[PDB]
Design a protein around this motif. Sequence first.
Motif, short mmCIF file in Angstrom:
data_model
loop_
_atom_site.label_atom_id
_atom_site.label_comp_id
_atom_site.label_asym_id
_atom_site.label_seq_id
_atom_site.Cartn_x
_atom_site.Cartn_y
_atom_site.Cartn_z
N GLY A 299 0.78 -1.22 0.00
CA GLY A 299 0.00 0.00 0.00
C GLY A 299 0.81 1.27 0.00
O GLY A 299 0.23 2.36 0.04
N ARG A 300 2.14 1.17 -0.05
CA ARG A 300 3.02 2.33 0.01
C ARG A 300 4.15 2.12 -0.99
O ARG A 300 5.19 1.54 -0.66
N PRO A 301 3.98 2.57 -2.23
CA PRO A 301 5.03 2.34 -3.23
C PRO A 301 6.29 3.14 -2.91
O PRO A 301 6.24 4.17 -2.23
N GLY A 302 7.41 2.65 -3.41
CA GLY A 302 8.70 3.23 -3.08
C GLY A 302 9.81 2.51 -3.80
O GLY A 302 9.58 1.80 -4.78
N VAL A 303 11.04 2.70 -3.31
CA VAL A 303 12.21 2.15 -3.99
C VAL A 303 12.13 0.63 -4.00
O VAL A 303 11.92 -0.01 -2.97
N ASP A 304 12.28 0.05 -5.20
CA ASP A 304 12.42 -1.40 -5.35
C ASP A 304 13.89 -1.76 -5.22
O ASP A 304 14.71 -1.28 -6.03
N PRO A 305 14.28 -2.55 -4.22
CA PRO A 305 15.71 -2.90 -4.02
C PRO A 305 16.36 -3.81 -5.06
O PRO A 305 17.48 -4.27 -4.82
#
Length: 306
Positions: A299-305
């Motif tokens: 529910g909180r998109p962000g940096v994909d490692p």
Amino acid sequence: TTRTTDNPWLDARVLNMAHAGGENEAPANTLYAFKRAVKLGANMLELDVQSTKDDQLVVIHNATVDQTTDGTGKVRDLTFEQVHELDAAYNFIPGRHAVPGEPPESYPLRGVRTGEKKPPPGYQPSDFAIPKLADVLEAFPRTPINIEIKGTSDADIPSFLHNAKLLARLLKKTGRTDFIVTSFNDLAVAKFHLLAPDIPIAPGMAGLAAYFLLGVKPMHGTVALQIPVRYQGLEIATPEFIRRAHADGYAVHVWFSGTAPDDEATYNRIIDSCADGLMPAYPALLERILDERGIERPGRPGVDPC
């Protein structure tokens, strides 16, 4: 026409699955640890289950109460009433899970359960006892849970099967499906999936070997592969193996438990290995790591490692 493949656990990432609630930051498998861990950002709970004499499922790792409480004996020999009188933070020492035998000064939370230290603000004495799964469930109605079926012995298969049975009876009455049910013993996983077919599972150790070495896909219902970091000298939580498992549509949930340190260096490396969840002994530390690198979450998109 074939129903399409739909695995939601490939979008439930990245997960902070507090291991026993976070056995290095809080007393393991207590409602305190579980409540503490969800508040500090953990997306999901990880616990173990045994049964009492009167066939109640209680949240606890070891077959005996000796290590984490002030009592003694196997939980299968005690009634639920007898198990619950105990102080399930009797031996908790931060940074070391539970170590019996130290000076009474080592144990910050010894005494809260039995009413001889005030609890942390906002908690009651019962939050420091061995809980009932039913009491963890209704405490956490919107929180996903990872229930690991346990036994009396590595050689006692019926005790696992007994617990798989009681588990499936009670998780069917909840109507929930936001669980993942696994065990080291593969039979109990198969027993559980036959009684409770709608509940997502994860392979026992034979089912994990047969996919990591031979490539053989795990039992139907398998939703993710919950693996250690290292095992028998061999590395298992590598980018190679995790990429092949996402290729096969499985989510990957890595755990630690002395196969690897519970520290920032390890946590970060496994996060880069693109795993979908970590089960840390330090849920606060993992939550700092995830927040400062800004990493994607449910529910909180962000940096994909990766």
